Design a protein around this nucleic acid. Structure first.
Length: 112
RNA sequence: GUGAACCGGAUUGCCGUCAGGAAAUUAGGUGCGCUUAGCAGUAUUCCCCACGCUGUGGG
C-alpha cells in the first residue's frame, strides 16, 4: 500500500475514535444536556485536526459504544480535506488517539 | 565339613474317517415447553511513565 495524496484533495475517510480525557483517571468524553453527542465528537475531533493535518468538512456519528477486553469507541464517517501532504503522512500509520494496541487508531482514506 | 561328601528316569508315538436346528408371530392404545429483557444519549476506564495544575505516550 503506497498512499500518495496532493494538497487540497478531497478524500473519504472512516475512523473509529477513542473518546479519552484525563481529569482529577482517564474518563470518557462527556457533553452537555443541551448538545448532541455527534456535535461534541465533531468539535472534539476538529480541535485536534489542526495538528493532525486535515480539515473536516462534514462528519456524522455511526456507532457509539464500548470495547471490552473498558474503553469508549465511536465510529465517525464523513468528508475530510488534507491541509498539507507532509503532516498527513505522519498522522497516517501512527494513530489518532490512545489504546492503539486494541485497534483504535486506524484510517481508511478513499479518493472522491 | 552334619548317617555325611562324589550323584541326570533317560531314550520311542496323527485321535483319523460322518452331520441344515427347522417349521409360526402388529408392541399397540394416551400428551401446549408456557409467562421476560435499548449493544447504547454520557457524569470515574484496570494498570504504568513523562509534561502541566487537561494535552501527548504504553498496555
Amino acid at each position: 500500500y503506497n498512499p500518495e495524496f496532493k494538497a487540497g484533495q478531497l478524500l473519504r475517510f472512516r475512523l473509529r475514535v477513542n473518546a479519552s480525557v484525563r481529569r482529577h483517571k482517564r474518563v470518557s468524553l462527556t457533553w452537555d444536556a443541551s448538545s448532541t453527542p455527534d456535535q461534541a465528537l465533531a468539535d472534539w475531533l476538529a480541535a485536534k485536526s489542526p495538528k493532525l493535518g486535515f480539515t473536516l468538512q462534514r462528519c456524522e456519528l455511526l456507532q457509539l459504544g464500548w470495547v471490552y477486553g473498558r474503553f469508549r469507541a465511536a465510529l465517525l464517517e464523513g468528508v475530510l480535506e488534507v491541509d498539507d501532504p507532509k503532516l498527513f503522512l505522519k498522522t497516517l500509520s501512527s494513530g489518532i488517539g490512545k489504546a492503539k494496541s486494541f485497534g483504535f487508531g486506524l484510517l481508511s482514506v478513499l479518493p472522491i
